[PDB]
Amino acid sequence: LKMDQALLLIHNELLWTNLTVYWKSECCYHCLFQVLVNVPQSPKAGKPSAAAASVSTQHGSILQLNDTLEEKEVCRLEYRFGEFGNYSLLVKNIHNGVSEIACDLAVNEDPVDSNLPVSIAFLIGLAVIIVISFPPRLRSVDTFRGIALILMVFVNYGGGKYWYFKHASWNGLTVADLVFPWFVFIMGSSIFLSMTSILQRGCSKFRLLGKIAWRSFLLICIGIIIVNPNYCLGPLSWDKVRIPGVLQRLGVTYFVVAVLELLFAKPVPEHCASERSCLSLRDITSSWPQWLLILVLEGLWLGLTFLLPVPGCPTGYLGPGGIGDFGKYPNCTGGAAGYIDRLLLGDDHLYQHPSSAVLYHTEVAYDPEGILGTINSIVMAFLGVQAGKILLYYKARTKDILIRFTAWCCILGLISVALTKVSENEGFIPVNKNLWSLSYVTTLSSFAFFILLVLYPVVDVKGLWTGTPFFYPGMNSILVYVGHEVFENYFPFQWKLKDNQSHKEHLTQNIVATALWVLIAYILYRKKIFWKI
Amino acid sequence: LKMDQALLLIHNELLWTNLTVYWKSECCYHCLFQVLVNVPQSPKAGKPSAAAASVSTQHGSILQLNDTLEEKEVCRLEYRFGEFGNYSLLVKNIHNGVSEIACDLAVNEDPVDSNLPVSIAFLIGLAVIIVISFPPRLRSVDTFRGIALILMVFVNYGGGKYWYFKHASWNGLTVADLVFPWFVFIMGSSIFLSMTSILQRGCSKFRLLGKIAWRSFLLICIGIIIVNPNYCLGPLSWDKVRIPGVLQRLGVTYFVVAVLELLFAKPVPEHCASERSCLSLRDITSSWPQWLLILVLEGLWLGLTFLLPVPGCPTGYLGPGGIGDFGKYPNCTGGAAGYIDRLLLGDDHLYQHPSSAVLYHTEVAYDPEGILGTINSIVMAFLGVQAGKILLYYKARTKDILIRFTAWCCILGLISVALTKVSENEGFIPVNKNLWSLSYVTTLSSFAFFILLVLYPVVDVKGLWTGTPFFYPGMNSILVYVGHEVFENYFPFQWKLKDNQSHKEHLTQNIVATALWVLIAYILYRKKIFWKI
Ligand SMILES: CC(=O)SCCNC(=O)CCNC(=O)[C@H](O)C(C)(C)COP(=O)(O)OP(=O)(O)OC[C@H]1O[C@@H](n2cnc3c(N)ncnc32)[C@H](O)[C@@H]1OP(=O)(O)O
Ligand SMILES: CC(=O)SCCNC(=O)CCNC(=O)[C@H](O)C(C)(C)COP(=O)(O)OP(=O)(O)OC[C@H]1O[C@@H](n2cnc3c(N)ncnc32)[C@H](O)[C@@H]1OP(=O)(O)O
Ligand SMILES: *[C@@H]1O[C@H](CO)[C@@H](O)[C@H](O)[C@H]1NC(C)=O
Ligand SMILES: *[C@@H]1O[C@H](CO)[C@@H](O)[C@H](O)[C@H]1NC(C)=O
Ligand SMILES: *[C@@H]1O[C@H](CO)[C@@H](O)[C@H](O)[C@H]1NC(C)=O
Ligand SMILES: *[C@@H]1O[C@H](CO)[C@@H](O)[C@H](O)[C@H]1NC(C)=O
Ligand SMILES: *[C@@H]1O[C@H](CO)[C@@H](O)[C@H](O)[C@H]1NC(C)=O
Ligand SMILES: *[C@@H]1O[C@H](CO)[C@@H](O)[C@H](O)[C@H]1NC(C)=O
């Protein structure tokens, strides 16, 4: 018995009905019934036949008995199983009245509760906090980036082998999905904050364009050579290299938004601040040509995804392949993004095993961070640029900045509610990390606005907290990222586990590895070593 | 047919003699005859039986036919085989006179000459040189260390799969063996050069001892955690960790010689220089107490190796195990060093596969850099300290320093000749890297004295060469070492080879990797980034 399983042995007593047991989870959307076990017929009178099977306990189970010769369903039960439990399903015949078939399930051994280590760890963290309590840079931006870094290091090392510290298979939001867009939002803000400071004191655009180009080139080089390939399985060879990647995506969106802001730059007006609703939206109207291009790119993304003809697959398709959507479309994982990507780069230059495979059973390859999602990344980086413009235009009165942050958060939350139709698998556009939906960027940017609204009158102005954890990694992000990608298997971060089937046994190791990375970040702050790409 | 092999098919014509073919290489010392092929008897008249076998071409071959039923040797031939050649051995019966058995060997396909890429590469290097031609630091020490670093990076990546760019199996000296002791000699010199400068300007011994201790601790930590374990094969676990290592050895010898010089330090006498033979050996007589301890440690090493009783093995044994020494002692790879090491640390905490295994066929484990060789490392580091004392005592006249270097080189060369008895496998103490012989340290220190004698009136005084290659890696040694140990499988250094059986195909890749490391060292010099443990 492995993790998230429960031995289910079935006893069948009926004289002459050879039985089939089917299975399907409760979360899987429009999924066919596969097979679990085929119990044998009662060989002799009063000596029932028995079979053994294993059922997953991560989500609820639907179990169907359907016979072998015929189709009439003998029984169905829908129930939820706990980890490492002897459960006993009995199917019998009811003597009273007409002949009837009934199923009774009895627990032999009780299961084991699995959220106890999470509870214990979070109370111990609260107790430790209770014992502990008794060209300027901006503190709030650095604090938020540090929180994103500790979440990324913890989730990428290991979630404790938990399903809610892991990317969802399709059409869902978890703790793991939240981390990546916030980096893009911070990156756009940092673009505006750096660029306004360099253009002042005297500089040339010809000077700055080389810097932008060189940064983009270096990021594209670092991702392909170092981060992507697995160098334990063999020497690197072309026709087997993965070109799409996270650093290439960051580099291309950085190049586009940086050049686009550099072309249309205007000096910041003095005494720009006014009372609320009396500004005349001067921050908005100073960016008049650059909004139009972003609208054209979003119109292109909508039109391409919904209306492009694709051979074999339906023309606009958002669902998974394989078993999902009833196995009518057994390829078509990507849709119109997958066809575009599988006509230019190739099919061998893509990520072989996607997240959707484990539940939806899709054979064909998909890349989470490839082509046609870059447009939405540019849109969200522009939103971060918009936040950065707000901070430097109106920084006389605190009340003004809070009003803009509140209004922007409410309007983005309203559009993401209206598009999502407040569900998970329904609506015009669902929220999905793999396709980089407009709903996805629209819901996480509102959370970023709310988090900045909470932090700014505490960590940055009129201090009530020193923000002491979470800016020490914030200053050095690229060292931490390359460090955990290169040094992942080394001894202080990882060691051999003498029980491989415990959530409890993994969680402490991942927590210690995250704490060690925070300690390394703290040592480098005191030694005043900062590296910037 | 793989590298360094040659297909040898044998034709036997005799009517009734079933034959055995034996094999033994020409370099292997007191080695038994194993089996190569068992050809079958002539089944019919005039229809000879045939067999196929492969013979290695790295060294010469001795081939014996000895029959199966009896013992009378049918024939023997001793010859040298070339790579990838059809050779044809015929054994027949001579009709004339008495019955006689003769063997004739005829070449069907000529072999391929294998030193052509080395010749081509070294002429191309000469042609490139011909095209190219038309608290102070000391330059000569840095230049010598850089040469040692490029040799170490080239040999450790790959020798071109050549036997003379690789450690010898036992009792031998190659290009690969020379690299490591020179680092210890440079290290001892750098100890004296730093220590005399820090004691002047005002300092305390209590201040310096912590620095020495901290450096030793860090080196011991770096070697065990990072350099030794192979982290692709599994997570690290104790009872399977290798404690002996190169960095631990450097750390312990550094601690001993640094503390020993710090205890007995005396200020450098002004106007110490004199005419040759008129100094009264003042450099020698200022170190009077510290010579005695080194003599006691060397006496301990000699007495322990020659006279310690060891169970099962002979009491003082220097030979290999397995097949070597005629298979009389089938264990006893280590001797009295192996027993001492296999009684303290363990047998699981040792290096599993030694260099001697491929030719001598030894099953038992040995560690090249463990316990009881540390004493000789301390002796050679003290010799480097002695060279450093010569440079600062007598640096008024150049002629004086040259006379001391010449005399020291001649006396060490004379002792290493007298001990080695100018042979390879004979003498009282042979030269061996694995046991760290007195002969080994005595012969390489003389070469270090000669190389310093050549470099010092050229690179350091009265320049005729700028030493432009070989000091750029010399300043940063620890970064280069940790860099090639961690980044060994990455793309610019290594790539997939579409022919795996060519010396020519490997050599270019290793040369390019060495040149890239020299380029990285050059970039860091201009950027003025220097790190010191
Ligand atoms: C599921 C997953 O795996 S999610 C994967 C995502 N995780 C990653 O780590 C991806 C890698 N990304 C990164 O490391 C970072 O996002 C970066 C470094 C590439 C960019 O983030 P940035 O905010 O731009 O960082 P960085 O510090 O390099 O910023 C560069 C400039 O911004 C400036 N800056 C940054 N923060 C601030 C601030 N708070 N105030 C003012 N200026 C700032 C810097 O001074 C610098 O300007 P300069 O070079 O002109 O002096
Ligand atoms: C087969 C194989 O694999 S062989 C394996 C061996 N190869 C290796 O790379 C092993 C690793 N060893 C090393 O990297 C080096 O030997 C080291 C760094 C550990 C030590 O070598 P060192 O000569 O001591 O190097 P390093 O530069 O660190 O020397 C430290 C001190 O010497 C001083 N120094 C070094 N060279 C000189 C010089 N020419 N003149 C004056 N001072 C010098 C430095 O200034 C420093 O003094 P400070 O810290 O007080 O300012
Ligand atoms: C089980 O039987 C039901 C009803 O007869 C039928 O609808 C269903 O397709 C069957 N399941 C499978 C997997 O054949
Ligand atoms: C409970 O599980 C164990 C697992 O080995 C099994 O042997 C035992 O038969 C189960 N109990 C019952 C009543 O089946
Ligand atoms: C797509 O589905 C077909 C069956 O309709 C299958 O044969 C094919 O192998 C699938 N594609 C891949 C890449 O496996
Ligand atoms: C081969 O025969 C010779 C002479 O009869 C004998 O000395 C030798 O031991 C034999 N070799 C082997 C391996 O038996
Ligand atoms: C030469 O080598 C080839 C290798 O395939 C072999 O087939 C051929 O028979 C050899 N020549 C002779 C004359 O045996
Ligand atoms: C040492 O030799 C004996 C045979 O004499 C052998 O059984 C043993 O396994 C050898 N040692 C090792 C470690 O293999």
Author numbering:
A (entry chain B), B (entry chain A): 49 to 182, 237 to 635
In the authors' words:
Our structure reveals that HGSNAT is a dimer where the protomers are related to each other by twofold rotational symmetry, and the C2 axis of rotation is perpendicular to the plane of the membrane. The primary mediator of dimerization is the disulfide between C334s within the LL2s of each protomer (rectangle inset). The catalytic H269, which is predicted to be acetylated during the acetyltransferase reaction, is ~4.5 Å away from the acetyl group of acetyl-CoA, nestled within the negative charge on the luminal opening, and is ergonomically positioned to perform acetyltransferase reaction in the presence of the acetyl group acceptor. The ACOS in our structure is relatively more accessible from the luminal side than the cytosolic side, as the nucleoside head group of the bound acetyl-CoA blocks the cytosolic entrance of ACOS. However, we were able to confirm the presence of endogenously bound acetyl-CoA in our cryo-EM sample by LC-MS. Based on these observations, we conclude that the structure we have is of an acetyl-CoA primed HGSNAT waiting for the protonation of H269 and the availability of an acetyl group acceptor to carry out acetyltransferase reaction. However, according to the structure, these amino acids are ~34 Å apart making such a bond impossibility in the acetyl-CoA bound HGSNAT conformation reported here.
Heparan-α-glucosaminide N-acetyltransferase (HGSNAT), a resident of the lysosomal membrane, catalyzes this essential acetylation reaction by accepting and transferring the acetyl group from cytosolic acetyl-CoA to terminal α-D-glucosamine of HS in the lysosomal lumen. Mutation-induced dysfunction in HGSNAT causes abnormal accumulation of HS within the lysosomes and leads to an autosomal recessive neurodegenerative lysosomal storage disorder called mucopolysaccharidosis IIIC (MPS IIIC). In this study, we use isoform 2 of HGSNAT, which is produced as a 635 amino acid protein containing a 30 amino acid N-terminal signal peptide, a ~110 amino acid long luminal domain, and 11 transmembrane helices (TMs). Each polypeptide of HGSNAT has an N-terminal LD followed by 11 TMs that comprise the TMD, which is ensconced in the lysosomal membrane.
